[PDB]
């Protein structure tokens, strides 16, 4: 054997064990989700409060690309930042040449090809993050999830991290109960509930909730963070449902 | 470009590639340098498993770096050519910029620096060569003899030997060389050099080379008969 010691080596199965090992690092990370809605997308993430000494609201994990795309990820946080930095470069050169802001499917493949490139050589390590991202473009709303292998698909709802199965189950119920569609303001509230429900798989340390959203009507097609009254309202909704 | 760090430290603090290069020097034919009151003599062993040789055209063991400095060596022959070439080029470059030929110390310091560079550069192995560099500084009559080795260290010697069985000939020189009174003449210096090689060589026929360097670019190589006379004289005094 020894097939798992080097990146880009096929095992006799036809598998790249190094990528599968990077997935284990993602599974170890905190929970993050994405919900597609009527005219946009909503992102949410679990922030473990390791200590009283952490300044609340001041270790922001959700990241914006361009002015219309949001990105969140679980796993190795630095690896995620590297991917977003590339995403920002990709989006900038697209807008430079073609004038229009980068479409979400176009942006999704830019990240996909870049992550896939890190499975082609033994001189690089695969990414230790699964990234949930999306936004609003000329063709409407799009939600995507990208994995260490470079694999990505479009999603109605997406989840990754330690509480992914709990969050996936809760997401599937929303898809079944709302065939016509979910509103942006509703999706924010649901996002809070699902993070709180997914926190049961990480319940030693208590946590801090963080939400963001893009909506054609509510945010005018731009990425914004949910703060203040709208955040507390979403927290209270989640608190009422666990009890 | 090929980048691999071939020369590296081991747990005990040794650089094995440099030390194994010293083993290549130990395998090489013996070379000896002895400096007198007014001269330096470089003696060299030539192995006799090679008959049917052409000695006219076969590369000589002692090489002129400039008209006033010479270089002999022990170890890998192919490696030595690279050091000799670089030294010869630096000799002409020094004359061009300083308007004065190199000192023996300077030429030695350069060659030693080249050897050192190959011990901490990527993609290269050390030189499997130790050198004896001898000559006279410009407008100076004090004899100079220096030694270098694969690691890059260099130093001055009253008399020194390198190569196979060099520990035997070094033993000989240590009791037969007086610091207070070095070989006063050319004859005395050549004889002590030939004597020291006869402890190790075999026959004094076409196995020993001798080169004498005197002040002001006066370098000459001895022929077979000239060397054979020293061999004949030493053996007759020995039977006593």
């Amino acid at each position: 054997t020894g097939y798992d010691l080097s990146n880009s080596v096929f095992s006799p199965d036809g598998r790249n064990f190094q990528v599968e090992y990077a997935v284990k690092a993602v599974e170890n990370g905190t929970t993050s989700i994405g919900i597609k809605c009527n005219d946009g997308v909503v992102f949410a993430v679990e922030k473990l409060i390791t200590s009283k000494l952490l300044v609340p609201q001041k270790n922001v994990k959700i990241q914006v690309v361009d002015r219309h795309i949001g990105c969140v990820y679980s796993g190795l946080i630095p690896d995620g930042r590297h991917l977003v930095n590339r995403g920002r470069e990709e989006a900038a050169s697209f807008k430079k040449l073609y004038k229009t802001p980068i479409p979400i499917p176009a942006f999704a493949d830019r990240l996909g090809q870049y992550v896939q490139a890190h499975t082609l050589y033994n001189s690089v390590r695969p990414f230790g993050v699964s990234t949930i991202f999306g936004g609003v473009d000329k063709n409407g709303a799009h939600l995507y999830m990208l994995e260490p292998s470079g694999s990505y698909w479009g999603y109605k709802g997406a989840a990754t991290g330690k509480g992914r199965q709990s969050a996936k189950a809760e997401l599937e119920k929303l898809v079944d109960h709302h065939p016509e569609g979910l509103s942006a303001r509703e999706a924010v509230k649901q996002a809070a509930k699902i993070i709180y429900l997914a926190h049961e798989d990480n319940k030693e340390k208590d946590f801090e909730l963080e939400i963001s959203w893009c909506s054609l009507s509510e945010t005018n097609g731009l990425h914004k963070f949910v703060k203040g009254d709208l955040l507390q309202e979403a927290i209270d909704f989640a608190q009422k449902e666990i009890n | 470009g090929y980048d691999r760090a071939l020369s590296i430290f081991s747990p005990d603090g040794h650089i094995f590639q440099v030390e194994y290069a010293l083993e290549a020097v130990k395998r090489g034919t013996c070379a000896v340098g002895v400096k007198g009151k007014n001269c330096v003599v470089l003696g060299c062993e030539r192995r006799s498993t090679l008959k049917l040789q052409d000695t006219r055209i076969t590369p000589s063991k002692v090489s002129k770096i400039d008209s006033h400095v010479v270089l002999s060596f022990s170890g890998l022959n192919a490696d030595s050519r690279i050091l000799i070439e670089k030294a010869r080029v630096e000799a002409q470059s020094h004359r061009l910029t300083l308007e004065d030929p190199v000192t023996v110390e300077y030429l030695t310091r350069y060659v030693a620096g080249v050897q050192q560079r190959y011990t901490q550069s990527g993609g290269v192995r050390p030189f499997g060569v130790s050198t004896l560099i001898a000559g006279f500084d410009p407008r100076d009559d004090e004899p100079k003899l220096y030694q270098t080795e694969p690691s890059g260290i260099y130093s001055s010697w009253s008399a020194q030997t390198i190569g196979r069985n060099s520990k035997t000939v070094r033993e000989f020189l240590e009791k037969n060389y007086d610091r207070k009174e070095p070989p006063a003449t050319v004859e005395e210096c050549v004889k002590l050099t030939v004597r020291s090689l006869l402890e190790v060589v075999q026959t004094g026929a076409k196995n020993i080379e001798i080169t004498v360097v005197k002040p002001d670019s006066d370098i000459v190589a001895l022929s077979s008969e000239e060397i054979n006379q020293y061999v004949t004289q030493i053996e007759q005094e020995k039977q006593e």
Binding site: K24, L53, L54, D79, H82, V124, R125 | -
Partner: protein, 231 residues
């Protein structure tokens, strides 16, 4: 075991052992403490010597008039990273006439450390850093780890026996955060914090190192007889 030969290799459980071994170098380092109020931010560092004949290794480095850090681990790596911060702070001033935000400083350090954990040939940085600063949004304290992870805090500590000071600050949180407009008292709290990490040794005059930055105070370092006030 078989997966710790280089940084480019994941373990079967998804760990990067070279990054973890770099993290271990920080734990061996001498203790240093960081804490802040709303007006000032303070670094306190225990310096370490080779023996009684030697000097005490300097732990604190200035990056700009409004920013600087303390180090624990490989000191040369702290010199490389602090130099990078000096350049980034400086680029911000020359090009934009703008003092670099302490948060951006953290983001830049994170991304620089990350690149060394995903490529063949290189190695992770072997040092942890506590960055303090005062910018347009007040006082700040950051904790840098060579894994790439940067974290903003009210107070913290890194190095050997840093858990003692970290627990103390966790208890004292409500007190020291409201030490506004009083430098000497905020330092006293930091000196008392680092004292919870001492064993057999106590704070002497050429052992202690303090730094402070704030509203009307440039980043300045105190050593020697200037810290005798706080023992």
């Amino acid at each position: 075991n078989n997966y710790d030969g280089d940084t480019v290799t994941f373990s079967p459980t998804g760990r990067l052992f070279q990054v973890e071994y770099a993290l271990e170098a920080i734990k061996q380092g001498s203790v240093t403490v960081g804490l802040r109020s709303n007006t000032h931010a303070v670094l306190v560092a225990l310096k370490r010597n080779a023996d009684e004949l030697s000097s005490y290794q300097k732990k604190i480095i200035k990056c700009d008039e409004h920013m600087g850090l303390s180090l624990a681990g490989l000191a040369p790596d702290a010199r490389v990273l602090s130099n990078y911060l000096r350049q980034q702070c400086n680029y911000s001033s020359l090009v934009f006439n703008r003092k670099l935000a302490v948060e951006r400083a953290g983001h830049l350090l994170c991304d620089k450390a990350q690149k060394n954990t995903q490529s063949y040939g290189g190695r992770p940085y072997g040092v942890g850093l506590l960055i303090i600063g005062y910018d347009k949004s007040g006082a700040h304290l950051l904790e840098f780890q060579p894994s790439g992870n940067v974290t903003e805090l009210y107070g913290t500590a890194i190095g050997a026996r840093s858990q003692g000071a970290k627990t103390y600050l966790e208890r004292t949180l409500d007190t020291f955060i409201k030490i506004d407009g009083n430098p000497d008292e905020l330092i006293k709290a930091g000196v008392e914090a680092i004292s919870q990490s001492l064993r057999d040794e106590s704070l002497t005059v050429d052992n202690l190192s303090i730094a402070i930055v704030g509203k009307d105070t440039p980043f300045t370092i105190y050593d020697g007889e200037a810290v005798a006030k706080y023992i």
